[PDB]
Amino acid sequence: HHQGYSNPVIPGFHPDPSVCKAGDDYYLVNSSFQYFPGVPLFHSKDLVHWEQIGNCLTRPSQLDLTNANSGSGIFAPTIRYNDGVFYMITTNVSGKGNFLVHTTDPRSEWSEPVWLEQGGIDPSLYFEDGKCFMVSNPDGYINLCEIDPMTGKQLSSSKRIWNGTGGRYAEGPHIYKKDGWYYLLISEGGTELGHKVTIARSRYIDGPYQGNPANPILTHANESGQSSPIQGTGHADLVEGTDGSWWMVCLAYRIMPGTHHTLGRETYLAPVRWDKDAWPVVNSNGTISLKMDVPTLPQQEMKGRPERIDFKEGKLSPEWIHLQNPEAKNYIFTKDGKLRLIATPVTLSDWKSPTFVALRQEHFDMEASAPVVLQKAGVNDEAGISVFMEFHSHYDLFVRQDKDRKRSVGLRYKLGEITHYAKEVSLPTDGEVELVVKSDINYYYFGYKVNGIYHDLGKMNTRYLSTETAGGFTGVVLGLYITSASKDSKAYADFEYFKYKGKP
């Protein structure tokens, strides 16, 4: 196919996209905040269909997430390719700030961090004439310097080059050179409903820069975007097509009733007209749509998330994520190919890493389920599935060990000072329990199946887990977890599979 695609191109929690072209291959990275591994890494041949090939930050030495939460950890990343080397540059705001890692093979383990001198966030690199130029946004000014990207040494003084058109929170700077102009693209307006992309240019990389009279080049903040199901379009990165066409990846989100979003900021694609000696124009009127009826590069489908993920390979795919730095020894694979989680007393509301491993929710309408076999449990030990936004904002569905060798299914909502037990239901002595979470745009629905019978446990509003309600920079994840109620506990839980099916 050479025509038409659906947005978002990477659904669910995938913000701040940056992309690079390496020959006929495209590589893309997203911000990941408090989650480990960090900086998911995607590959495409057409900019539409993406396979997650790994993550850039896969080892604790690359990624200290001590006390990280949805408002901290890893912020926007940028990926670049130059002279056979890939660079990923980002900020760990919970740690030592701006750094990069590099590799000659994106599928391998990337380097240890190279810490950088210039401050602010949203660092980016541009290469020319054997030089490596870094931009970032300290004190709201886009600053430029030259660096040695292998040693981290700053080679020239930082220079303030632009501070945008006047909008709030000037960020996400990237430099491109085209038609003898240095173009400087940024985000303004904040990453909520006022998000916009603006652009300026200069004959000199160090300015002065003049803004495009047509700014902003992409936004749904104005009348033209007010009725769109997509809002908050911004944080773009321009990339060339294999046929000489132009494109941008950007973040946005899909709004829900009352102006909420729970799937995070996702990655979207837009075509760009960029004639010789002209300013770029994004999809004719600076808006994007869910159904994009436009010409594309020759399309090639990629592997996606299985509807039934099993653990027979004794490894988790790159899609799975933990909270902060996990205790690796508490995640093992059994001889018969189940995922075994080892209990600790850390709850999902402790602001520390629990025994917890999750997949991003990627559809409004979905069903997820897993069988749970809780073993060697003391009273009040529990294991199950959590619909998780933040340590103070999550819905937990679980099997619990009770006194006198009894067990129950519980449903608990954590919302700030509320911990609400919606249901506590006695289970039969025998029978494997499958826990089930469904959703539509309005509600999560909870249930369980045992001895061939499915039981409804009730429903809860989606809005209380939104970014607007809960705060932060992330989306809902669906996590398998286990928590013990004693230190003395030897409890563990086996999960034979994880099912996830989204409606397109």
Side-chain angles (χ1 to χ4, degrees), residues 1-290 292-299 301-302 304-311 314 316-326 328-334 336-402 404 407-485 488-489 491-502 504:
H1 224 140
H2 297 83
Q3 182 79 21
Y5 64 94
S6 298
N7 261 325
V9 296
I10 313 178
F13 162 49
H14 294 101
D16 302 319
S18 170
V19 62
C20 70
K21 183 176 186 296
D24 285 0
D25 294 297
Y26 296 102
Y27 297 90
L28 180 149
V29 289
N30 301 116
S31 47
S32 52
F33 302 91
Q34 76 274 38
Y35 292 99
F36 183 99
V39 187
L41 181 64
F42 295 88
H43 170 250
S44 187
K45 310 292 289 204
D46 65 8
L47 301 167
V48 173
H49 299 98
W50 297 89
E51 182 193 347
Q52 193 175 347
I53 61 166
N55 291 277
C56 295
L57 309 175
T58 49
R59 308 187 302 283
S61 70
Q62 299 171 299
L63 181 47
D64 182 4
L65 288 166
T66 303
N67 302 136
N69 60 48
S70 63
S72 65
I74 295 286
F75 276 21
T78 295
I79 192 171
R80 300 292 179 244
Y81 177 73
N82 186 75
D83 196 24
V85 184
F86 293 88
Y87 301 85
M88 190 288 298
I89 189 172
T90 188
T91 317
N92 186 168
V93 305
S94 303
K96 298 197 312 176
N98 286 325
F99 72 102
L100 65 78
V101 297
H102 54 84
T103 191
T104 61
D105 179 358
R107 294 186 184 260
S108 74
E109 293 288 325
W110 292 54
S111 74
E112 298 300 317
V114 179
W115 299 98
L116 302 172
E117 302 182 37
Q118 185 170 280
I121 62 162
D122 294 8
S124 180
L125 300 176
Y126 164 80
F127 293 84
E128 191 185 349
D129 292 334
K131 306 177 207 170
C132 177
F133 295 93
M134 177 182 171
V135 292
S136 60
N137 74 345
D139 307 305
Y141 296 92
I142 307 310
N143 276 241
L144 177 68
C145 66
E146 191 186 335
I147 65 167
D148 180 326
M150 294 292 152
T151 71
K153 187 174 174 206
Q154 187 167 320
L155 304 178
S156 64
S157 303
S158 290
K159 287 194 194 155
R160 294 175 312 267
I161 62 173
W162 200 41
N163 59 341
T165 71
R168 66 168 54 198
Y169 298 133
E171 67 191 345
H174 305 298
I175 295 175
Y176 315 92
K177 194 185 189 184
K178 191 181 181 280
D179 304 323
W181 290 108
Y182 292 93
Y183 286 89
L184 171 58
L185 179 142
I186 74 168
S187 283
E188 298 174 32
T191 194
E192 318 83 22
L193 299 180
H195 213 185
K196 61 187 179 176
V197 177
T198 67
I199 196 173
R201 74 192 183 193
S202 185
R203 294 301 189 181
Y204 296 98
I205 196 173
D206 57 341
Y209 282 85
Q210 286 177 124
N212 186 355
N215 274 329
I217 63 171
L218 172 68
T219 192
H220 286 190
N222 289 333
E223 188 277 347
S224 61
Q226 72 192 24
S227 71
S228 181
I230 300 164
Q231 297 292 320
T233 59
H235 212 102
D237 197 14
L238 286 155
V239 66
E240 196 180 3
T242 51
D243 61 353
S245 63
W246 285 92
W247 298 85
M248 60 169 54
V249 298
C250 71
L251 75 77
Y253 52 94
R254 286 178 285 168
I255 64 166
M256 308 161 91
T259 308
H260 290 283
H261 76 281
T262 54
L263 306 182
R265 298 167 298 159
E266 319 172 274
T267 295
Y268 293 73
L269 179 69
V272 179
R273 173 72 73 190
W274 207 353
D275 288 326
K276 178 185 176 278
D277 301 331
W279 292 96
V281 175
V282 184
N283 192 38
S284 290
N285 71 351
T287 73
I288 60 173
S289 294
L290 294 168
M292 293 292 286
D293 179 21
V294 302
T296 69
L297 298 178
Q299 294 180 34
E301 290 177 45
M302 291 290 196
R305 184 184 292 181
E307 293 188 353
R308 186 184 184 280
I309 109 90
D310 69 75
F311 306 110
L316 294 178
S317 83
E319 294 192 63
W320 294 89
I321 49 177
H322 302 272
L323 287 161
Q324 302 175 354
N325 297 109
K329 73 174 149 69
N330 296 332
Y331 308 87
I332 59 186
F333 296 88
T334 67
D336 60 1
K338 308 187 183 180
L339 173 65
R340 175 165 296 172
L341 299 191
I342 307 300
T344 75
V346 180
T347 74
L348 308 190
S349 308
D350 279 339
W351 304 78
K352 298 293 185 166
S353 187
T355 304
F356 171 103
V357 67
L359 291 171
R360 294 161 177 85
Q361 184 170 344
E362 293 178 348
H363 305 76
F364 289 132
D365 296 356
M366 67 85 203
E367 177 173 316
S369 72
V372 188
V373 182
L374 175 65
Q375 293 164 79
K376 304 289 164 188
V379 177
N380 293 144
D381 293 358
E382 73 180 54
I385 307 168
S386 183
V387 185
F388 185 98
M389 173 57 90
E390 183 54 285
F391 296 110
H392 59 44
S393 298
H394 52 92
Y395 304 158
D396 307 341
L397 173 63
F398 55 84
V399 174
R400 185 178 66 198
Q401 183 67 63
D402 305 315
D404 308 321
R407 296 200 167 176
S408 51
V409 178
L411 181 60
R412 195 178 47 232
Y413 310 142
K414 171 71 177 184
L415 291 174
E417 296 301 311
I418 289 165
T419 145
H420 183 74
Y421 285 86
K423 288 293 186 175
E424 292 179 275
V425 180
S426 177
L427 283 165
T429 317
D430 300 320
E432 177 177 280
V433 175
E434 189 184 18
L435 299 179
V436 184
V437 182
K438 309 172 194 181
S439 66
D440 61 33
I441 202 172
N442 306 127
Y443 302 103
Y444 286 94
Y445 306 87
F446 302 93
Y448 69 101
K449 187 172 183 188
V450 65
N451 302 139
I453 305 176
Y454 177 79
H455 297 94
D456 171 41
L457 288 166
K459 75 184 186 190
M460 189 50 206
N461 310 261
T462 56
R463 63 179 182 259
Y464 296 106
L465 300 186
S466 74
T467 287
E468 293 84 352
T469 302
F473 289 128
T474 61
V476 168
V477 308
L478 303 174
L480 299 180
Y481 81 95
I482 180 170
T483 300
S484 54
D488 61 81
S489 177
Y492 56 92
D494 293 343
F495 304 83
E496 187 170 333
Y497 62 78
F498 189 93
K499 280 175 173 184
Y500 179 95
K501 190 177 175 192

